[PDB]
Amino acid sequence: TSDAVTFITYVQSLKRKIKQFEKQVELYRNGQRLLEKQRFQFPPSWLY
Amino acid sequence: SSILSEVSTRARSKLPSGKNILVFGEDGSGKTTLMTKLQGAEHGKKGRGLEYLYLSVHDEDRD
Amino acid sequence: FYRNALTRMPDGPVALEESYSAVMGIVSEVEQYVKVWLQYQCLWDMQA
Numbered sequence: 001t002s003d004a005v006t007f008i009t010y011v012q013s014l015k016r017k018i019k020q021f022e023k024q025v026e027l028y029r030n031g032q033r034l035l036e037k038q039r040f041q042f043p044p045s046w047l048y
Numbered sequence: 049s050s051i052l053s054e055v056s057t058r059a060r061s062k063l064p065s066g067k068n069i070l071v072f073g074e075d076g077s078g079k080t081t082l083m084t085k086l087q088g089a090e091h092g093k094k095g096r097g098l099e100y101l102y103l104s105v106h107d108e109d110r111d
Numbered sequence: 112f113y114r115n116a117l118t119r120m121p122d123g124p125v126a127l128e129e130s131y132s133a134v135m136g137i138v139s140e141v142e143q144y145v146k147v148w149l150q151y152q153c154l155w156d157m158q159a
Contacts, residue, residue, distance in 0.1 A: 037111040041060050041156055056153040096117055097127060 063110060069103070 035042075073079030076094070083101050084092040092101060117127065 033109065039156070041158055055157050056150075059153055059156060096114055098131070 071079055071083070073082075080092050080094055080099065084090065087102050087104055092099070117124070120126065
């Protein structure tokens with residue numbers, strides 16, 4: 001049960017970061033669509 | 049030589065262009081009215097032979 | 112008012128058609144002279 005509860009407390013910690021991550025997501029849709037409409041050359045190492 | 053040419057050659061991407069729309073409608077079937085309402089003009093010109101209009105297509109995502 | 116002269120054409124639609132041809136000619140040449148010249152815009156899309 002220690003392994004299962006470790007899994008669960010880890011995912012509970014992830015629960016909090018879920019929303020901060022999501023707002024990171026839409027702020028980067030903001031930034032990325034901005035950058036495309038700023039027409040900046042995306043480097044080859046850019047991950048889409 | 050080149051170099052300038054080859055570095056210029058690496059254009060990042062492209063947006064769609066060069067499409068085409070045909071139609072048939074019988075004489076005075078409002079085809080011109082429908083087409084002209086598509087781009088917003090109330091009416092174009094009801095003439096003879098092949099005619100020609102626009103679709104000014106705007107995308108906000110690509111701006 | 113009379114709209115049948117196109118069928119009343121003595122030579123058939125050829126005189127009409129060739130007229131259209133001139134259009135399709137001219138515009139094509141135009142964009143051709145545009146195209147290569149427009150190529151210069153690529154210079155900005157690459158950064159120093």
